[PDB]
Amino acid sequence: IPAPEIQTVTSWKVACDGDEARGLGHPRVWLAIPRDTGWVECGYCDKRFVIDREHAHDD
Amino acid sequence: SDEALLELAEHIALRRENDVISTQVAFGELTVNATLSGVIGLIEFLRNDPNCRFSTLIDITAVDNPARPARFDVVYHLLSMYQNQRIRVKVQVREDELVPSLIGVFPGANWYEREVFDLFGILFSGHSDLRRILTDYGFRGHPLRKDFPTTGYVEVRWSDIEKRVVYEPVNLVQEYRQFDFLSPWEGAKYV
Amino acid sequence: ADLRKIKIDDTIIEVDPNMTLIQACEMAGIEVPRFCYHERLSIAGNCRMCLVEVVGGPPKPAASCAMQVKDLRPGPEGAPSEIRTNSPMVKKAREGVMEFLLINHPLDCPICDQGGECDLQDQAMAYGVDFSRYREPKRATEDLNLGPLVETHMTRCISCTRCVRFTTEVAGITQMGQTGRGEDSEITSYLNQTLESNMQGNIIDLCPVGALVSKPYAFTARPWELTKTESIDVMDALGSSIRIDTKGREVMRILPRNHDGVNEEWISDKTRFVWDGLRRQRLDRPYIRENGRLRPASWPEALEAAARAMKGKKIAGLIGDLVPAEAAFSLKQLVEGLGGKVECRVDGARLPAGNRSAYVGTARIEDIDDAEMIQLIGTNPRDEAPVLNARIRKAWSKGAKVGLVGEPVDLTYDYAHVGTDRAALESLSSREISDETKARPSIVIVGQGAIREADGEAVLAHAMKLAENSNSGLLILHTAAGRVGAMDVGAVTEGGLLAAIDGAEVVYNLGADEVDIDQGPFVIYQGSHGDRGAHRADIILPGACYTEESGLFVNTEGRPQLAMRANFAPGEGKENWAILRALSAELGATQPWDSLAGLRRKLVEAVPHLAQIDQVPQNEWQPLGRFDLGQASFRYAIRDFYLTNPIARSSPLMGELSAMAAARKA
Amino acid sequence: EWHGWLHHTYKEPPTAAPLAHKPWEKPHEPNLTGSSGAYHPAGSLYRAQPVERRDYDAWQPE
Amino acid sequence: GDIRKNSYDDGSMDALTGEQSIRNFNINFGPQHPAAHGVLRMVLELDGEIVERADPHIGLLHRGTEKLMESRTYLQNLPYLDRLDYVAPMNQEHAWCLAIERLTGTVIPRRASLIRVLYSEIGRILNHLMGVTTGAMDVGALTPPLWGFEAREELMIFYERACGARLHAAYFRPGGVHQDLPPDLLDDIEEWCERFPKLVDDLDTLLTENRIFKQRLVDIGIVTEADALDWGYTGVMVRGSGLAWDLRRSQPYECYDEFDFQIPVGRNGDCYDRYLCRMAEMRESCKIMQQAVQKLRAEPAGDVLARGKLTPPRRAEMKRDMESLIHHFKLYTEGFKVPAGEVYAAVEAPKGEFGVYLVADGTNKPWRAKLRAPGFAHLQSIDWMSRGHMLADVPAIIATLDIVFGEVDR
Amino acid sequence: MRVRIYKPARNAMQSGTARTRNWVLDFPPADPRAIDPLMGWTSSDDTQSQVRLRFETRKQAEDYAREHGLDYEVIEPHTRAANIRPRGYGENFASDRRAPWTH
Amino acid sequence: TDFAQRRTMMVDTQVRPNEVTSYPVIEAMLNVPREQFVPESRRDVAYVGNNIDLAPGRVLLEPRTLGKMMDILNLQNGDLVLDVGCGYGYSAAVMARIAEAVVAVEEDAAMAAEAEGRLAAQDVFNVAVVQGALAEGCPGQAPYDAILIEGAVEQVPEALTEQLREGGRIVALFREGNLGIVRLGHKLDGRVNWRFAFNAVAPLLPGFARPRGFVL
Amino acid sequence: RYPNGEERCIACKLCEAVCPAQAITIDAEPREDGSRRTTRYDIDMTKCIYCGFCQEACPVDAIVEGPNFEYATETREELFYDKQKLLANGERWEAEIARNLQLDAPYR
């Protein structure tokens, strides 16, 4: 199954809430992108976050 | 009203010592536990006594407690519009024990005792018209006992063969689901 | 035995001074919240949820899990020491710790399998505040790769280290640890390797949150939907106490339940995860072989065909590993009533008949805990009874010495390798033992692998001789749940399997799937799963599995235990006693009972101790006399731990576990 | 598109204030109950291929 | 109190009256009968259309609500209250909430208290409009119900705008009310209150001084104070006889103390007095609705639920804070535990005193839930009330008692 | 029919002990459940299994079954005995420990 | 106690509204004192709408069941009726007021002797109480126009239905688990053909159970 | 569904647990991609009391009661809604449902 949505990020920790205004999404969760695979998927909405390795900024 | 209800409970305990087993005031309500043999005399005293003028019978019901030697409680709720107070009377009844009827005191007790008889199977002595009031004609069992199933045992259907509405054993397309949510943690009672 | 009085809140209670305050509180029926403490694990003291107030001590709250009663300073004049679990200090301490536990915890309850039976949810409801003050980003954690049994969501981990302490202390492996430091410290396996242990499924129960969850069970149910049945496991002869969780017609998972004398509160991975094989490869219709092919038949037709095959013939009855005692008793009554032979030792074990002290022994499982010397003879307890092996390890942790006769294997504890062959056994029995050694508690454990050869009776004779010399208990470790029960009803013939099959023309195979019946006789197979036994059969009568009927199973220590029905057999499967009762009518030998209760009345008349459920009978010591041993080395009974019975061999998960184990060994 | 306006839920008609639509939305259908397009459960005898149900796999003889 | 053997002013005794009564004129009055409310089977013994015996057979709508309640949580049981005296559902919800709140010792927010008074009085008008105008239809007036039920339609829209349901709101919750009212809804309730007295005048003009209406109600179903005490009368059934008893005053609950309203009472205790009392009560309820809307506007913004350990959090908090998500998860599955105890919580429902006798045992489900319906006690007295009247008076007597069988049968 | 009288065991998934105080009399399912062809729901004709009674002591449950002519089996509970550690928390650092404690 | 008022109330509210129209039955039930035909300890509850327990496994049927049972038998002035399991004889006394004569069969010598005493004390003379097993009936005085069985059965033995005249009627309460069906039988061409009458429940009579053994 | 087209329901079963009428039946497994999703989601519309508790309990706004009320059927089984029927309703009524959620969000 292909992801419903891909976002490219420059951080190894992302937050997802369904992108919906003022309580219309899902509970807000923080996800960790593994340094091995470089992507993580939201357990609520299945959105995939993919790391931009060259610009990935460690915090 | 808490001091008032405790004072009233002493008045009842004093004047009807042998009727009253104990009294309690909890959540702003006075409950009187009475003996089965003295309940009619006590309720009559409560109705007529000047200090406690409980001339409105709010209702009579029963509670099932299968873990107890006397499994049933019969509960009388009385209101006084003149004194502006309420009282609850509780008597413990064993299965197959007879409860004296209150219809001599309150004519309106008649239907409440039929309902207790129908839904719990408790018989009342001195009742003029004691028959089932809420269940179907010829119903088997007493549904508000804790050991009677929620869905009962039989269901009706119209039969084209008999041209009648007939009873049949219960068959559920989806069986009743009884979720158990209760947590294994009671919590604390902080002082 | 010098009990000490202590006042908890408003309860004065007398306790062993070695108890911790948390144990004393439970004895007084006072609830104390906890995450890191577990009764059977080493005290950790890291969650800080159990803090109580010691009246008169320093203002610091004390961790009740780590403070022994004797540590409390005595009250003035000798009044009992007081501790409060209800004071404002405790209320504030619990609210503070709960807040700290939740600031980084993910908002996962809807997608988390723990939801509904979560200690974090439940104690947060009872002991925390109802709102949040945390406004910062939360921690996010990467997940682990622990294998096909444990799914990980490590952002949920609350760092209680129960998993580390169980895998290290009880399971006896050293794969898990807590790396790093501070809020970035991670629970992990070394090199992110899958855990290698047949006890690993227990960390799913132990983990208080949904950090470690069951992969096979994931997403399939919520705790409130499940019907719970307290039953007995048959995947091995230990007879572990289990809880079977069903939803409608299907078992959804299997959980341990406590039995201090058998399995404590653990089960092995085979016991835990075989439910996926429960609904596969099922015999749900009768079959009859016609022109070399098995074709569906109705119950009346198959019973008639079986009755025709049996009437007037020489019948042998085989009783398999998973058969309950009533079915074995019924088969003995039926086949012997027709002048036939019934054997239960289908694995070749030379267990003496009628000598309960020789095929069961004299030691309880609970005796291993206190034993200071343990001798293993031709038994790998890690593969035959992993929970019982974990109990040996517990004794070894307290200092017990372990000796082994057999091939050197990894048992998770050290041992003395006395040798590998029957000469090594000979040396032990003939050795002299000091009066000091003979007075210490000890136990001798014998596996089925040792006694499965021609000299099996002699091997037992030396084991009893060694047990008698050392003044030690004896335990015969069985592999089959149904063996000791079958022996108790005397389902045996002189000469064993080969003496029951010699000359037979019909064999009634009641669930024996680990030995082949050679071509020739007419074979009727009664069973629940299609395996070796059904492939050979000329008539198949489908029976119920162990979760689908009530059954009596006698475990390896001789304790009779009742399995309870949790669900019903698929299709036309029938209870095993019922099939034999129905067949008896077609054979003109109707049995003297119409119900399982009637069968059980006759059974406890023949074997009275089967009426005493959950009690270990005392066996009269009757040592064996013939001592002629063989020369060969000992072989262990079990070759593949995960594929020992047809229900396990119908489980896709057990096949994966078996494949993984081979890939590790190679 | 018009249901909200016609039932006074929204003040303004979709001509003036059109509703936002997602690309995965599907066109409106009226009630189909008396027709062949009516919804029916998968196991319905109307379906003419009712879905067969089971919860265990049966052993098959060789 | 037995008129089956006719007594004549000339003392005559008929030969047939001497024989034992074996062949009597018995008729099923209901269940399928326009005056029987669909589920009343009243067996009437008539003698020249004089009612000599009335034998109500009930239970034709008994659905085992009290049994069904024992296997549900406290929140799952709240909609069952809607369906007892279903003409005014939120008034019945109120007794359930009050009983739980008393046992748990919970205080509800001020705004929730005002809303409960507001919609309780809407329910009283919803009931009295139904009672008075269908009572008129029982004595042959076709038009009054049409006028009255148009006003009911408007009030049912106020129901829907508060909770999304016209009848079975499930709006009062243990701990307050589920949602806050939109400001434009308060404007519309105020606008409706300004018109409503005009409809009451129109109904009064059509009925009150009509000679036919008076001859169908005056001196019919006379109740004395002593009769009221025989049969457990409450509500208008006692006030029509001149007893100024109203639970909102005698045993105040919510915030009724600070509202201004009066208690109408009758002097003759007949069907005409109880009709006038109900018309007057409708005017008083409209005034209360006006005061409540003014108080709600003057209130500071606040919550409508107690939150805490009793009610779920707000959805925005549930999706942001870990504590809120847990409390949402737990309170929508297990629900709150109610401490062991027994209470009887009563309200002045539109049809009389409605009460819940709740036995809690410390768990998340009621041990016993006994529902005290005023109509159960009122209907039981129909035999005494109807004895001696003519058959044409029976529908008027059924109307004056204000019976709905969702609560009689439960 | 046959009823089960037993003390429900602690749920292994949780450490609380509040659901382990009571005895229950249960009517176990009497006949197989079926799959509804239309929707796949679990069908049953066994309403007696809806009944689950709760008692405080084994005697109360056994009495009720006797007064009501019910054949019953009493399954005895397996209480977990306290694991009293002689040295308590200090055993983690005993000089004779086989291996270091892991914390 | 005013048992007359209770008796009239029982007929008005438990018999008349339950499709009992036969006035002979209503007249009989208005006159036969129910309390005189119950054990002394049950006298105050003689008119309750439930089965009265007489002996272990035996009851005096509820007034609705008996009223409807007699109404559908449609007894005539010239009928000879067999009342199986008469208990203390209440049902026999009621039927005696309609039929020509009643043969009341009781199996408990204690109840059979009490039935004779109580039947005589009410001056009932067309009722003979015959002591013996219920499932046998009384074949000495057969054939009967009507047979009433006063307790639940699972099967009616052929020996009992052979004592029925051609064109005779038999009414029995059948028990199928928790379900009770009163059926009315008609003897035609030697076979009794049963039909549904109404639903009611009572405990099973001793000797009328069905043969139930092992079933796979 | 979410704006990204994925189903909102994650098979938490809070709606099935709160339902006073037991009108909801759910079965779930891990999807092929490992996602937590239902395989059965039935609502018996002849058991449902239209109370709206399910949409209150849902943590992700997956199940809602929509604006449509004109769906009377000629056969009873047309009111046994399965998952695809319910999802089809959501795909046809999403635009109005989404607007209603925005209008009532300040009060929820």
Ligand code: SF4
């Ligand atoms: S572990 Fe417990 S609190 Fe944490 S997400 Fe899972 S259910 Fe919720």
Ligand code: SF4
């Ligand atoms: S994974 Fe579970 S058991 Fe292990 S430390 Fe974390 S919370 Fe504790």
Ligand code: SF4
């Ligand atoms: S609206 Fe219907 S499906 Fe939803 S919770 Fe209420 S009864 Fe259940």
Ligand code: SF4
């Ligand atoms: S619809 Fe909502 S509440 Fe119901 S299972 Fe799906 S996510 Fe959970």
Ligand code: FES
């Ligand atoms: S339980 Fe004591 S600190 Fe964790």
Ligand SMILES: [Ca+2]
């Ligand atoms: Ca995906």
Ligand SMILES: [Ca+2]
């Ligand atoms: Ca007259």
Ligand code: NA
């Ligand atoms: Na866990």
Ligand SMILES: [Zn+2]
């Ligand atoms: Zn997301």
